[PDB]
């Protein structure tokens, strides 16, 4: 690796400057993404299109001095591979032809053979890893068991999680069986991504923030802890750092540390300075800028990013922080603006580092 | 006279005989009698004082609740300001006109709450009479930030694209909008008090979308301004004020500076740590996930007991009102809130005698 500052920061090793990458850094806000996307087919076939996947993964790296690439894929690969039939309904988002509702439904789920069933994901990982030429590390990822379960039980996107929470409170042993199946699936999936070339791992618990605080531990967190216990710790003489991210989970930092994750993701509602003092060097932190900050002027973005770094380094620490947004880049962002974000993070860091 | 005022006492950290309880959206679609009354109404609901009064009373006939809440909508204010409220099937509330520019803000009219929203005041006074002192009546408003999101986006929103764009690109324009709304809400809430409201809740339903410093600047400070302008007492009783920012649990210490008597909590916030943090400086209201009511009777009783255990773990014997952490859903079985209410009242004896 010519550049490994991202990995060093996550592992709380000395770094020359603050690393940065951006969730959804490959996406519609880029004209070249849309142009590439138009040559492709249906929205479902994008992830299975290895050429497309590799191409759009590389595009933000050509524009911005990012310190990591992330696999272009979808968390919903796993429930599709488990046979629930993913499709997209314009314009209501992802849906499934089958839902999981009963004890027997859960028992009937097939075991995921990720290397075979999701071979197209592994081909993307390996192809991207080759294309990167060691320039920056590659992040592999999965949805969390709770977050994947919501799609499988609701049958798609959900604002209230009516059926999954009904299962949680009325049939908890059924939901636990589903979550356990998914934890094993995610272990297989992530380890296969590592085998294929992933150098860091992020678990996206996108809907864990919907849970009541005790239920977050029982029905989401404990299953992420199980996953991490099953992952390869190292590959090619290097630690593989793991990031856990539960958006809206800022009140639950202390439980999150018990997952054994190297790093925790934060959104904009969490003060970075108090999160840093609270975790006290026990884990690294990633985040946490509101993407809408990038709707402001160049000058305002610069000021906002400096303030965020001030919060990150107020406690005197010189590592353990990766700058990022608190959610994905929106499709409305002016492609000039993330450059301000990246360059300011790298340059202003000299105030605190070295 | 109030035959039952334990809700008001708890909000004011005064001694109570048992834990008070009411439920957000306790009048709503989950009740078959609501659906029947609603089918006879065909917004018209909110402007029909007879309808509004009737559905407000329905949950009180069914459950031993300790408060009634005015049946209305937070969006009465932007409708009265002329943005054209309507409801799209399966999509929620919408406005024909949106606020996007400095000129749009300048063009907003001054609200005369008692006249422009006379139907709200008539509902408040009619409900107050119909209650015959049974329980206190809660009046309410949306917060300036939360009202602003609907006015700028033009309806419900997942990302708040245009409101946050305005916040970061044109903060002076958003501040002017928020200030106009703060003045409007002061007049609206004071008019509800004049009409008979005995407690006030400010619903900052989308304040949890804000970055932490922006919560203070663009939501909290405007709720602080509102509370400073409210009538404090009427008819020999204090009028307690509740501030509720769903998703705002990380911000309890700043929230105290609103001057509110009580803060609402959702299910993501541990009640025991919240109680320790506020340390008797405000009352707390909440915080059950309404989906708990999807479980068995036995499981509801267990869950509610655990919640009260959290509320009273610190040995503090007042300053707590039980509630959900959000509105009751349309899918709840009407049998289930009775278990919630009765367990709250009975189990409290463990801590309150
Ligand atoms: Cl991402
Ligand atoms: Cl309500
Ligand atoms: Mg004006």
Euclidean distance between the first and final Cα of chain B, in Å?
25
Question: How many Å apart are CA A177 and CA A193, to the nearest integer?
Answer: 24
Ligand 1 centre from A228 Cα, in Å? 19
Query: Which of B329, B251, B323, B337 minimizes the C-alpha distance to B287?
Result: B323
CB contact under 8 A, A166 and B270: no
Residues in chain B with CB shorter than 8 Å from the CB of A214 are 306
Question: How many Å apart are CA A223 and CA A229, to the nearest integer?
Answer: 10
Please give the helix or strand (H or E) that residue A245 lies within, else none: strand A242-245
Question: How many Å apart are CA B79 and CA A202, to the nearest integer?
Answer: 45
Question: How many Å apart are CA A46 and CA A40, to the nearest integer?
Answer: 7
Q: Which of B268, B271, B333 to mutate to test the interface with A (most CBs of A within 10 A)?
A: B268
Residues with Cβ < 8 Å from B312, sequence gap 6 or more?
B320, B350, B351
Among this protein's residues, is B25 annotated catalytic? Answer: yes
**A286 to chain B, closest Cα gap in Å:** 15
Q: How far is CA A223 from the centre of its chain?
A: 16
Q: From residue A341, give the alpha-carbon distance in Å to each of A301, A309, A314, A345.
A: 7, 11, 19, 6
The chain A residues in contact with chain B (CB within 8 A) are: 160-162, 165-166, 168-170, 209, 211-216, 248, 250-252, 268-271, 290, 292-293, 295-297, 300, 304, 326, 330, 332
Contact B254, B214 (CB under 8 A): no
Give the dihedral sign, CA A246/A122/A185/A263: negative
Among this protein's residues, is B312 annotated catalytic? Answer: no
- Angle (CA) B26-B32-B34 rounded to 5° is 55
Whether omega before B324 lies within 30 degrees of 0, making that bond cis, reads: no
Residues in chain B with CB shorter than 8 Å from the CB of A292 are 159-161, 164-165, 167-168
Residue B105 has, within 13 A of its CA and on its CB side, a CA count of 19
Please give the helix or strand (H or E) that residue A67 lies within, else none: none
- Dihedral pair phi/psi, residue A20, rounded to 5°: -145, 140
CB contact under 8 A, A332 and B295: no
Residues in chain A with CB shorter than 8 Å from the CB of B265 are none
Query: Which of B285, B242, B246 minimizes the C-alpha distance to B261?
Result: B242
Among this protein's residues, is B29 annotated catalytic? Answer: yes
Question: How many Å apart are CA A231 and CA A244, to the nearest integer?
Answer: 13
For the record, the structure tokens of B276 come out as 């320790």
For the record, the structure tokens of B251 come out as 């911000």
Question: How many Å apart are CA A22 and CA A235, to the nearest integer?
Answer: 24
Assign 3-state DSSP to chain B and report helix, strand, coil percentages, each to 5: 50, 15, 35
Ligand 1 centre from A40 Cα, in Å? 20
Contact A157, A94 (CB under 8 A): yes
Ligand number with the minimum distance to the CA of B178: 3
Other beta carbons within 10 angstroms of residue A306's beta carbon come to 15
Question: How many Å apart are CA A276 and CA A299, to the nearest integer?
Answer: 26
How does DSSP assign B216-275, residue by residue?
Answer: IIIIIHHHHHHHHTS--EETTEE--EEEE-TT-GGGHHHHHTT--SEEE--TTS-HHHHH
Q: From residue A310, give the alpha-carbon distance in Å to each of A26, A64, A289, A305.
A: 28, 22, 13, 9
Question: How many Å apart are CA A188 and CA A180, to the nearest integer?
Answer: 13
Question: How many Å apart are CA B155 and CA B149, to the nearest integer?
Answer: 8
Which burial class, exposed, middle or buried, applies to A339 when counting CB atoms under 10 A from its CB (0-12, 13-18, 19+)? middle
Give the closest of A166, A271, A296 to B291, CB-based: A166
- Dihedral pair phi/psi, residue B113, rounded to 5°: -55, -45
Closest-CA residue in chain B for A172? Answer: B295
Residues with Cβ < 8 Å from A237, sequence gap 6 or more?
none
Query: Which of A313, A305, A289, A310 minimizes the C-alpha distance to A340?
Result: A305
Residue for token pair 């900050």 = A293
Dihedral class, residue A296 (left if φ above 0, else alpha if ψ from -120 to 50, else beta): beta
Closest-CA residue in chain B for A158? Answer: B158
Helices (H), A156-242: 162-170, 172-196, 213-216, 222-229
Query: Which of A269, A338, A236, A209 minimizes the C-alpha distance to A7?
Result: A236
Per the entry, the structure determination technique was: X-ray
Contact A202, A243 (CB under 8 A): yes
Residues with Cβ < 8 Å from A222, sequence gap 6 or more?
none
Residue for token pair 């503090």 = B316
Rg of chain A taking only CA atoms, in angstroms = 19
Among this protein's residues, is B294 annotated catalytic? Answer: no
The chain B residues in contact with chain A (CB within 8 A) are: 159-161, 164-165, 167-169, 208, 210-212, 214-215, 247, 249-251, 267-270, 289, 291-292, 294-296, 299, 303, 306, 325, 329, 331
Residues with Cβ < 8 Å from B278, sequence gap 6 or more?
B252, B256, B263, B284
Residues in chain B with CB shorter than 8 Å from the CB of A252 are 268
Question: How many Å apart are CA B99 and CA B173, to the nearest integer?
Answer: 10
Closest-CA residue in chain A for B252? Answer: A251
Question: How many Å apart are CA B24 and CA B68, to the nearest integer?
Answer: 10
Question: How many Å apart are CA B253 and CA B281, to the nearest integer?
Answer: 10
Question: How many Å apart are CA B61 and CA B191, to the nearest integer?
Answer: 27
Beta bridge mates, A202: A141, A243
Closest-CA residue in chain A for B248? Answer: A269
Question: How many Å apart are CA B321 and CA B241, to the nearest integer?
Answer: 13
- Dihedral pair phi/psi, residue B323, rounded to 5°: -165, 175
For the record, the structure tokens of B294 come out as 């999807």
Question: How many Å apart are CA A11 and CA B65, to the nearest integer?
Answer: 53
For the record, the structure tokens of B211 come out as 């970055």
Contact B176, B102 (CB under 8 A): yes
Other beta carbons within 10 angstroms of residue B19's beta carbon come to 27
Contact B199, B7 (CB under 8 A): yes
- Angle (CA) B192-B237-B240 rounded to 5° is 60
Question: How many Å apart are CA B311 and CA B283, to the nearest integer?
Answer: 11
- Dihedral pair phi/psi, residue A285, rounded to 5°: -125, 140
**A302 to chain B, closest Cα gap in Å:** 12
Residue A177 has, within 13 A of its CA and on its CB side, a CA count of 15
Question: How many Å apart are CA B8 and CA B285, to the nearest integer?
Answer: 12
Residue of B29, B62, B100, B238 with catalytic role: B29
Contact B323, B22 (CB under 8 A): yes
Closest-CA residue in chain A for B273? Answer: A251
Dihedral class, residue A41 (left if φ above 0, else alpha if ψ from -120 to 50, else beta): beta
- Residue A352: give the domain boundaries: 1-354
Q: Resolution (in Å) of the shown entry? A: 1.5
Where are the extended beta strands (E) located within chain B? 68-69, 85-88, 92-95, 137-142, 199-203, 233-234, 237-238, 241-244, 262-264, 283-288, 320-324
Helix-helix angle B171-195:B221-228, to 10 degrees: 30
Query: Which of A221, A108, A92 minimizes the C-alpha distance to A154?
Result: A92
Residue of B6, B9, B13, B25 with catalytic role: B25
- Angle (CA) A201-A203-A208 rounded to 5° is 170
CB contact under 8 A, B268 and A248: yes
Q: Report the number of secondary-structure helices (H) and strands (E) in chain B.
A: 18, 11
Question: In the 8-state DSSP scheme, what is residue A292?
Answer: G
For the record, the structure tokens of B151 come out as 């006015």
Q: What length is written for chain A?
A: 354
CB contact under 8 A, B247 and A268: no
CB contact under 8 A, A292 and B212: no
Residue for token pair 């070295």 = A354
Q: CATH number of the domain that B343 lies in? A: 3.20.20.210
Question: How many Å apart are CA B96 and CA B79, to the nearest integer?
Answer: 10
Query: Which of B228, B223, B274 minimizes the C-alpha distance to B253?
Result: B274
For the record, the structure tokens of B296 come out as 């068995």
Contact A69, A128 (CB under 8 A): yes
Query: Which of B343, B156, B352, B326 minimizes the C-alpha distance to B244?
Result: B326
Euclidean distance between the first and final Cα of chain A, in Å?
21
Residues with Cβ < 8 Å from A299, sequence gap 6 or more?
none
Question: In the 8-state DSSP scheme, what is residue B155?
Answer: B
CB contact under 8 A, A251 and B267: no
Helices (H), chain A: 5-10, 31-39, 50-63, 77-79, 103-107, 114-117, 119-132, 145-154, 162-170, 172-196, 213-216, 222-229, 253-257, 272-279, 298-313, 337-348
CB contact under 8 A, A269 and B292: no
Beta bridge mates, B304: none
Question: How many Å apart are CA A235 and CA B151, to the nearest integer?
Answer: 53
- Angle (CA) B87-B174-B111 rounded to 5° is 60
Other beta carbons within 10 angstroms of residue B168's beta carbon come to 20
Whether omega before B287 lies within 30 degrees of 0, making that bond cis, reads: yes
Residue for token pair 């992530």 = A190
Question: How many Å apart are CA A225 and CA A328, to the nearest integer?
Answer: 24
Residues with Cβ < 8 Å from B107, sequence gap 6 or more?
none
Residue of A29, A33, A64, A151 with catalytic role: A151
- Angle (CA) A225-A230-A232 rounded to 5° is 120
Beta bridge mates, B314: none
Residue for token pair 């592994």 = A122
Query: Which of B331, B132, B298 minimizes the C-alpha distance to A165?
Result: B331
Ligand 3 centre from B177 Cα, in Å? 8
Question: In the 8-state DSSP scheme, what is residue B288?
Answer: E
Give the closest of A166, A213, A271 to B268, CB-based: A213
For the record, the structure tokens of A173 come out as 């042993």
Please give the helix or strand (H or E) that residue B103 lies within, else none: helix B102-107
Contact B10, B19 (CB under 8 A): yes
Query: Which of A348, A328, A299 minimizes the C-alpha distance to A60?
Result: A328
Give the closest of A251, A271, A292 to B165, CB-based: A292
Dihedral class, residue A136 (left if φ above 0, else alpha if ψ from -120 to 50, else beta): beta
Contact A136, A3 (CB under 8 A): yes
Which burial class, exposed, middle or buried, applies to A354 when counting CB atoms under 10 A from its CB (0-12, 13-18, 19+)? exposed
Query: Which of B201, B203, B185 minimizes the C-alpha distance to B245?
Result: B203
Among this protein's residues, is A80 annotated catalytic? Answer: no
Q: In degrees to the nearest 10, what's the CA dihedral of A255, A256, A259, A262? A: -140
Q: Which of A293, A295, A332 to mutate to test the interface with B (most CBs of B within 10 A)?
A: A295
Give the dihedral sign, CA B227/B230/B236/B239: negative
Query: Which of B119, B137, B120 minimizes the C-alpha distance to B128?
Result: B137
Q: How many domains does chain B have?
A: 1
Query: Which of A284, A281, A294, A277 minimizes the C-alpha distance to A328?
Result: A294
Where are the extended beta strands (E) located within B9-73? 68-69
Q: Report the number of secondary-structure helices (H) and strands (E) in chain A.
A: 16, 11
Q: From residue A282, give the alpha-carbon distance in Å to each of A216, A227, A263, A323.
A: 21, 20, 9, 18
**A129 to chain B, closest Cα gap in Å:** 33
Closest-CA residue in chain A for B293? Answer: A169
């Amino acid at each position: 690796l010519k550049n490994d500052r991202f990995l060093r920061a996550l592992l709380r090793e000395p770094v020359d400057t603050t690393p940065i990458w951006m969730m959804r850094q490959a996406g519609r806000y880029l004209p070249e993404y849309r142009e590439t996307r138009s040559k492709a087919g249906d929205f479902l076939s994008l992830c299975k299109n290895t050429e497309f996947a590799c191409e759009v993964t590389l595009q933000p790296l050509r524009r911005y001095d990012l310190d990591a690439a992330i696999l272009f894929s979808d968390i919903l690969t796993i429930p599709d591979a488990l046979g629930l039939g993913l499709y997209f309904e314009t314009g209501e988002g992802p849906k499934f032809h089958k839902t999981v509702r009963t004890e027997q439904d859960v028992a009937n789920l097939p075991k995921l053979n990720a290397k075979a069933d999701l071979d197209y994901v592994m081909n993307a990982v390996s192809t991207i890893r080759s294309a990167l030429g060691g320039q920056v590390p590659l992040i592999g990822f999965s949805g969390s068991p709770w977050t994947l379960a919501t799609y499988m039980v609701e049958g798609g996107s959900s604002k209230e999680f009516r059926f999954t929470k009904q299962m949680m409170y009325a049939q908890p042993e059924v939901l636990h069986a589903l979550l356990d199946h998914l934890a094993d699936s995610v272990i297989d999936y992530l380890n296969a991504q590592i085998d294929a070339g992933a150098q860091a791992i992020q678990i996206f618990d996108s809907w864990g923030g919907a849970l009541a605080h005790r239920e977050y531990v029982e029905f989401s967190l404990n299953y992420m802890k199980k996953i991490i216990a099953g992952l390869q710790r190292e590959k090619d003489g290097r630690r593989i750092p793991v990031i856990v991210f539960t958006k809206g989970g800022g009140q639950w930092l202390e439980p999150m540390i018990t997952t054994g994750a190297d790093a925790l993701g934060l959104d904009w509602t969490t003060p970075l300075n108090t999160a840093r003092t609270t975790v006290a060097g026990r884990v690294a932190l990633q985040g946490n800028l509101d993407p809408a900050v990038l709707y402001g002027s160049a000058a305002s973005i610069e000021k906002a990013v400096k303030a965020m770094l001030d919060d990150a380094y107020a406690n005197g620490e010189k590592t353990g922080y990766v700058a990022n947004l608190g959610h994905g880049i929106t499709q409305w962002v002016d492609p000039a603006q993330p450059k301000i974000f990246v360059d300011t993070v790298h340059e202003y860091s000299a105030k605190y580092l070295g």
